[PDB]
Amino acid sequence: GITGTWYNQLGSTFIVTAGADGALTGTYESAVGNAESRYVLTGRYDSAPATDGSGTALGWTVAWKNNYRNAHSATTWSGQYVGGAEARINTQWLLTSGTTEANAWKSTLVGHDTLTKVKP
Amino acid sequence: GITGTWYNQLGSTFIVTAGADGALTGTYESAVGNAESRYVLTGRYDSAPATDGSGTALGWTVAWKNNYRNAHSATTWSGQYVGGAEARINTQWLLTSGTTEANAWKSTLVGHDTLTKVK
Amino acid sequence: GITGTWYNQLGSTFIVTAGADGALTGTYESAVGNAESRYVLTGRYDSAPATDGSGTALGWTVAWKNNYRNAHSATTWSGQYVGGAEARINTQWLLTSGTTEANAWKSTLVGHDTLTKVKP
Amino acid sequence: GITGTWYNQLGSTFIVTAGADGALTGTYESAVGNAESRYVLTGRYDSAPATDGSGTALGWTVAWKNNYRNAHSATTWSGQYVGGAEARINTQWLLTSGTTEANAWKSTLVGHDTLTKVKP
Ligand SMILES: O=C(O)CCCC[C@@H]1SC[C@@H]2NC(=O)N[C@@H]21
Numbered sequence A, C, D: 001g002i003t004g005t006w007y008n009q010l011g012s013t014f015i016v017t018a019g020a021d022g023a024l025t026g027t028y029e030s031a032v033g034n035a036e037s038r039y040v041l042t043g044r045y046d047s048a049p050a051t052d053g054s055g056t057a058l059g060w061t062v063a064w065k066n067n068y069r070n071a072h073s074a075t076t077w078s079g080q081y082v083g084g085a086e087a088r089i090n091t092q093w094l095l096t097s098g099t100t101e102a103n104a105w106k107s108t109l110v111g112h113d114t115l116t117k118v119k120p
Numbered sequence B: 001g002i003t004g005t006w007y008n009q010l011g012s013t014f015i016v017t018a019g020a021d022g023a024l025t026g027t028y029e030s031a032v033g034n035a036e037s038r039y040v041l042t043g044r045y046d047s048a049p050a051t052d053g054s055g056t057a058l059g060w061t062v063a064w065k066n067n068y069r070n071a072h073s074a075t076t077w078s079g080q081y082v083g084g085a086e087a088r089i090n091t092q093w094l095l096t097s098g099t100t101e102a103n104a105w106k107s108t109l110v111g112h113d114t115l116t117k118v119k
């Protein structure tokens, strides 16, 4: 159910393939921030989730460098896939920028993204 | 500078290879939690960082399933590599457990790990 | 715009008075977790928000001890108040439980609550 | 115990009084960021912690407005007091800036501060 094209609340696009042994591969395009076009992502998911109603744990990373720009930053999303009539991925994320040691206290933004397969 | 074995403040071991393109691949072994032996990790790093002494941004994911057990959870670490005599990878992490929707509010732990070349 | 009763997505109830001195005072009642009845909250808010269309930054703390139980934990919420017809307080939170040092790595849950004037 | 003057790893100063009612009151002065001089804080702590070696849960809030400056932001620290020979407070924090709706995704920084009573 994870394999597909997903969109978050900002209008960003998450194109992912879930491999049979836990791999996530694909591309991410952010609607916001110091970013343009598509970026490589990789991650992991639980390929044998519980069967008791629980979601499927997963996470992935984007380093914000591509052929067009380099933000010197990386985001990781940690969350779960929730199956149902409308499948959803609920995440929290951490966006770390490369900083000097003096500025490291303000290196990391935190937020939450929810994704569905509905195109905006 | 990223490639190799790193140790965190909990006694865990991060073994990673940084590819020329920005790929991170390797294994993670946690000293704590619902974990035994090594787990696959994958992630990404900035392969063309600033040259002013700023850190190199990176992140990786472990899904806590291996040949030996499955915790039904995943951790992501987001942080930066700082090189030099006292090299370090400083991270914050999010550990999400599969939950029912009613329990989703308590799905996610947050913390911070510092990794060094010597334990 | 802040003083009064607010409800989050879990069904919890936030009762607050925003004082001229920047103070937040009131009670919190959680629909979930190791909690029953009302708990004291205190916090702070920006009493002179930006002259533009920006939210009002605020935060508050509950220690989860009242006359009935003690969960040996505390939650802080950090966020912003957005006024208008569909007024909202959008927050992220950190729930820290008292733990031994060996277990400190798993002391802190993170999440996000959205509060509205009408119960969802 | 908690009452006293604490310094964090950045050199910031946390002057706090822990009341018998579970209240924290005092002032905070940051070594970094969009801040000058002292700011009011308020928070809560577990006034009847466990006796099994666990820490004491606590949290507090600063809104970054005083007589001199307004950053239109608020930080909450959530953590625990660890009562060794050398007492320490270990926290994680959320710093939310007031933003427009379109920029709300980048409203919140996350980090971790550790404090002791040792004057740097
Ligand atoms: O500005 C940067 O440093 C790079 C782009 C960051 C975009 C972030 S990642 C978290 C959030 N979710 C999105 O889809 N976009 C923003």
Ligand SMILES: O=C(O)CCCC[C@@H]1SC[C@@H]2NC(=O)N[C@@H]21
Pocket (backbone or CB within 6 Å): B008, B010, B012, B029, B030, B031, B032, B033, B034, B035, B064, B071, B073, B074, B075, B093, B095, B111, B113, C105
């Ligand atoms: O308990 C689980 O669900 C799986 C093991 C989690 C171990 C966590 S990941 C973040 C922190 N850093 C570590 O080295 N181990 C813990």
Ligand SMILES: O=C(O)CCCC[C@@H]1SC[C@@H]2NC(=O)N[C@@H]21
Pocket (backbone or CB within 6 Å): B105, C008, C010, C012, C029, C030, C031, C032, C033, C034, C035, C064, C071, C073, C074, C075, C093, C095, C111, C113
């Ligand atoms: O279980 C505990 O330790 C005390 C109750 C915690 C309830 C949390 S606070 C964050 C979230 N928002 C709520 O309204 N309830 C939960």
Ligand SMILES: O=C(O)CCCC[C@@H]1SC[C@@H]2NC(=O)N[C@@H]21
Pocket (backbone or CB within 6 Å): A105, D008, D010, D012, D029, D030, D031, D032, D033, D034, D035, D064, D071, D073, D074, D075, D093, D095, D097, D111, D113
């Ligand atoms: O820049 C601002 O918006 C106001 C000042 C914020 C200072 C932060 S709060 C968390 C961290 N710990 C500190 O002692 N200072 C910084």
